[PDB]
Amino acid sequence: MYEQLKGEWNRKSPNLSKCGEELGRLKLVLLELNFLPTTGTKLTKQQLILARDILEIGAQWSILRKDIPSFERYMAQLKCYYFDYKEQLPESAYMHQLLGLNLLFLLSQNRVAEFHTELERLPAKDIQTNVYIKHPVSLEQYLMEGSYNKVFLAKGNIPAESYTFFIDILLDTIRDEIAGCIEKAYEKILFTEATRILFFNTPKKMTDYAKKRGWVLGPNNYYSFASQQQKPEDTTIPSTELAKQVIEYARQLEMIV
Template sequence: MANLKALYNDLQKSFNSNDLKKCGTLLSQLKIGLIEAGLLIPQGDPSLDDLIVARDILEIGAIWSIRTRDVPSFDRYFSQLQTFYTDYSSLLPPSKREYPIRSLNLVRLLTQNRIADFHTTLESLPLPADAIADNPYISHPVNLERWLMEGSYSKVWNAREEAPVEEYKFFVDSLMGTIRNEIASCEEAAYENLPLKDATTLLFFNNQSEALTFAKQRGWQVDLSNSTIVFAKKGEENMEIPKEKLITASLAYARELEQIV
């Protein structure tokens, strides 16, 4: 434990200085240390101080994962933290990082369009329903989910700057990527062309250069002389209707009904 706590102190310093590379190295060493000490999944009768250190290491790991844009790593850290947040919640003092991390997990579920899991996770929080609105970390993803269901994408975009923790922006940016593709599909179906300026606004880009890059990815034609985006129209598919098969099937169905009656 002495070596583990020394590495833990180094991790705190690296995390506070945002040295992500060193944090990654220390976290790998510390997870091995937690396994050897029986603290990654607590066993036996560990001391309160050891549990607090283990929880803090995993919480730093969860936030580090988001800062390094490693969502699978965040999933693993969050899963490991559940033991501390549930089984040992009555023994451990509250953690100031618990609800920011819980809320990041909720936003992650939204970005993956796992709406059912979002609601299940929300209902399992150790918070009464009337306290959710008062918790800035939990109310933020709840509002995001409502705005997504309403199609109020501008509110989702504006919420990026109102996020209670910086790490939210990574997930909201990912969410906006999905939203942009949905909006783009609607534009292709509704318009033959759009002014570049309007397309930039509708797609929530900060400048026309970003819109041009997106247009290229979608295969749109850009008329720079007129500052217009021309949407590529897909040819109408000609589908031959199998009339004889449909008639035969309908007659057979009618005969079976007559026999039943």
């Protein structure tokens, strides 16, 4: 039945010399039958259930190797396979932990319109069930407001699987966020408070941020350059823009249109 695969898929072969035979093996799937969704011959599922499971495990170790541009090729074709209305598995032990895995990497991608455009397929699975997909949407929901500590509780409080590559992008894209949150109008913060707001005791990461931005290393001191002074008192820019707008009034007032 041209299988060739069923020996080293579950035991770890992380970027070994299985993967090229796997890719040209998928080329051998292409020579056999197109991944066009096979509208007729519903009894022939071996091109769909088996080869799709091949394509989702091939999606799965792509984050293990950290191959980001191919990962959305795999996962995109998977979503194009669950695009089919043909009676298949409704889900598996993977469909939540892969579709919402795409929702979690896509969330790390900082593309929120795509984050919400992907939610138009799993309704009731939002709150009333499917806690493993309730977890990323409540997570990013907590990223919407100033929920930080609960987000770093979720960080770790993952129930589904590793998600490590995603929560490290999430570990950063909030590192620059706190690294901006020091920059608001605060008092002299000692070397303990903002030292412990993230997750550090005393490395030189406070020297990485304290020399990256201000709030400079001082006598138990973070310096406040809350200036915000220069930008007001502009009449001339209104004396040009309003000089445009008043003429624009005079055009559609006397000149016949």
